[PDB]
Design a protein around this ligand. Sequence first.
Ligand SMILES: [Zn+2]
Ligand SMILES: [Zn+2]
Ligand SMILES: [Zn+2]
Ligand SMILES: [Zn+2]
Lengths: 301, 299
Amino acid sequence: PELRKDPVTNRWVIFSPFKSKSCPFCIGREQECAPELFRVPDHDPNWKLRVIENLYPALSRNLETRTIVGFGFHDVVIESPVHSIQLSDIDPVGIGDILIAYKKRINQIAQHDSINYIQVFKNQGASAGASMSHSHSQMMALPVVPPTVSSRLDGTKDYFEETGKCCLCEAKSKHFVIDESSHFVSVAPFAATYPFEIWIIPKDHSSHFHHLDDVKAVDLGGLLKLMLQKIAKQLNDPPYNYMIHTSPLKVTESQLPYTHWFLQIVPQLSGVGGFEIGTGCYINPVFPEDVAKVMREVSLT
Amino acid sequence: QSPELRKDPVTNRWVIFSPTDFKSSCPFCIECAPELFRVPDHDPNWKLRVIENLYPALSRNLETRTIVGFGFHDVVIESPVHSIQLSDIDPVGIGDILIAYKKRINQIAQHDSINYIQVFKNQGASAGASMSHSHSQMMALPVVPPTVSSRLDGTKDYFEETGKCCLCEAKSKHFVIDESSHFVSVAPFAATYPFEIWIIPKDHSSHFHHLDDVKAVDLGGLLKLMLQKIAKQLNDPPYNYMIHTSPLKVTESQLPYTHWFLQIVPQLSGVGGFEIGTGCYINPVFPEDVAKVMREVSL
Ligand SMILES: [Zn+2]
Ligand SMILES: [Zn+2]
Ligand SMILES: [Zn+2]
Ligand SMILES: [Zn+2]
């Protein structure tokens, strides 16, 4: 029983020593969805993925301006035409299509100086915030750098000021590797927030996600595919959340030395109570040292 | 209404707003872990009692990028009868619960190894409630938590601007639901959760354990004028409530802008990617609507 901290989260966690618990997005019904922004391959009727708006967005793109009007970009990414295929089934090259696609929609938003941050994420399972079963992802442009980012800037910075090192750059000497690819390496966070949380960090110190290329998007695809697969099994196909962390669009040169984006997967294994809510502090019932082992063992025979 | 981000000094961060419509014996009754004390003292005809937590998040026996698990994890058995709920208990018995907290904060304080104490309550497994027997808990910590530190930032940066404590400015910076003798309840302007409710002392106090017997009954009542409305209007949803107080060693300097309060959150929805990735929340109901439906509710 101890408290572990990390520059990235910039907060302490308590470790105290597990399993789970057609459609308007299908090809053809593509006329029931909100205005289309683009698809892949380019406007081809034999599509593999596409990004659409959001009928009832969390932030409106039609309001571009103690309070701030709810302007933002709330977009949806249909990962496939096939209703039976999930992100775990897609071929590594296909995930790459998704990752290169996120890059696309992200590169377009950057043109709007009003976008402070952009959160891209994946919800699989109703309880984990996913209505439809059809494979889909989302994007909510934000006119405000969020708390996890502000915390991360401060954390890694403080660390960098006192060590000159980029915490996520010495990943091999910080966390617990589950798998490793050409330009990426997944890990069990040394100070992970949730049970069986996994981070996939790029190997090159890059301060932003939309800097990756096709070759790397397919390589990161497989590592992400391998991690979701070992998760889906070893943990009895539990629901999970997927979100990408990266420096805001206005990130400063000075912040660049210690700013490095990463990918995080959180399988929904348990909820929270009054302790976590009131403090922001959380409890993890599964050490990362015991996640790394089990993870490097799970098979797919 | 149309989307509208809001931020409060207390949370010190923005929240998204984009919207009546919402829906929904044991070994502890008069075998438990070591007792700290009960009420009345050593009295067998007991109402409440506080015991060690058989399996502590932070072990009191550890007392010594990583820190030792030292900490106190205690439990407050709120009732002798298995079939009772805080909302029901008379404003008196609850006061004894509150006083028990205050009394507990006092003892814990003696330890310098501790920096923050977190008092809270869970009801309904779905909200973390351990067992069905009415109870609450107190978690002692060797570190001040993000919310307190975050709040310390916002309550200050806001004070260094208006020279005032936003919480003493409750009535004016929020949506009043109900007021009692020494406390008031509102719908926080930038509330995090739908139907989230705050009960704030009207006098500028910086720490909960400073509350006295009169205020404890006045509070016991308001905390009883809100919950009965929550259980009704939302139809007995699970819920969590957690008092937010200053650090064990808050500095005199931070004192003018550190005002404690109790947060009640009715469980009406879960979280997802966006939330975990940003730390920002999406709330389906403006405190205005909430403030307008909670006044109407009749008990
Ligand atoms: Zn579908
Ligand atoms: Zn790096
Ligand atoms: Zn009982
Ligand atoms: Zn005040």
